């Protein structure tokens, strides 16, 4: 049976395809598809981005490294990598040591 | 509420910590912790590695880029990146177009 780790990897890919298949090339994200994905799937991790079209505009341009106005899977995974690392760092910030009790924030 | 994508990112980090916290430094994987994680969490994605200590030995040495005999989070995420890309490619191989029906293999 698929492990928690394998399920998580598959779900990341499935989520990308849920938005990439809507219009244009079915394996790339148009601006509209990327914004939809960010607002629906990263509304907590990218809370300031969902309500701010401005930062989404910067991020699309940063990720679109071949300047073809769509995000390939490989281009979009640069964002996933940044999010994973940021979440790891924030998880540690929210779980300080030495309090003799647990914390439950996770990452934000 | 956390999205499927956010849940997947958190679960990846939680799975790393489930094995990194067992011994030694609580935020790095010893050889024993890494092998345990691979055998328990990547038994399908890395099916040939779980039953083959040999390939796990190569992978640990490839990932341990500072040669300190443990995998940091950053070092271990190089493996996660390779797995995500490999799963994406295999998902496409298992879902050929033009058959007029669905396929259900996912990635392996
Ligand atoms: Ca598309
Ligand atoms: Ca592009
Ligand atoms: Ca450890
Ligand atoms: Ca190391
Ligand atoms: Zn794809
Ligand atoms: Zn506290
Ligand atoms: Zn950690
Ligand atoms: Zn078929």
Curated annotation (Swiss-Prot), chains A, B:
One of its GO terms (cellular component) is cytoplasm. It comes from the Eukaryota. Ca(2+) 2 binds at residues 64, 66, 68, 70, 75. It is found in: Secreted; Cytoplasm; Cytoplasm, Cytoskeleton; Cell membrane. Disulfide bonds: none annotated. Ca(2+) 1 binds at residues 20, 25, 28, 33. GO terms for molecular function: antioxidant activity; calcium ion binding. Residues 9-44, 51-86 form the EF-hand domain. Zn(2+) binds at residues 17, 27, 88, 92. GO terms for biological process: actin cytoskeleton organization; apoptotic process; astrocyte development; autophagy; innate immune response; leukocyte chemotaxis; leukocyte migration involved in inflammatory response; neutrophil aggregation. Changing residue 101 to A: Reduced histidine methylation by METTL9. S100A9 is a calcium- and zinc-binding protein which plays a prominent role in the regulation of inflammatory processes and immune response. It can induce neutrophil chemotaxis, adhesion, can increase the bactericidal activity of neutrophils by promoting phagocytosis via activation of SYK, PI3K/AKT, and ERK1/2 and can induce degranulation of neutrophils by a MAPK-dependent mechanism. Predominantly found as calprotectin (S100A8/A9) which has a wide plethora of intra- and extracellular functions. PANTHER family: PROTEIN S100-A9, S100 CALCIUM-BINDING PROTEIN. Homodimer. Preferentially exists as a heterodimer or heterotetramer with S100A8 known as calprotectin (S100A8/A9). S100A9 interacts with ATP2A2. S100A9 interacts with AGER, and with the heterodimeric complex formed by TLR4 and LY96 in the presence of calcium and/or zinc ions. S100A9 binds quinoline-3-carboxamides in the presence of calcium and/or zinc ions. S100A9 interacts with amyloid-beta protein 40. Calprotectin (S100A8/9) interacts with CEACAM3 and tubulin filaments in a calcium-dependent manner. This is Protein S100-A9. It comes from Mus musculus (Mouse).
């Amino acid at each position: 049976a698929p492990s928690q780790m394998e399920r998580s990897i598959t779900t990341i890919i499935d989520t990308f395809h849920q938005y990439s298949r809507k219009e244009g090339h079915p394996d790339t994200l148009s601006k509209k598809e990327f914004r939809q994905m960010v607002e629906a799937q990263l509304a907590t991790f990218m809370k300031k981005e969902k309500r701010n079209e401005a930062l989404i505009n910067d991020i699309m341009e940063d990720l679109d490294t071949n300047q073809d106005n769509q995000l390939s899977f490989e281009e979009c995974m640069m964002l996933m990598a940044k999010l994973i690392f940021a979440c790891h760092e924030k998880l540690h910030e929210n779980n300080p040591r030495g309090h003799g009790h647990s914390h439950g924030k996770g990452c934000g």
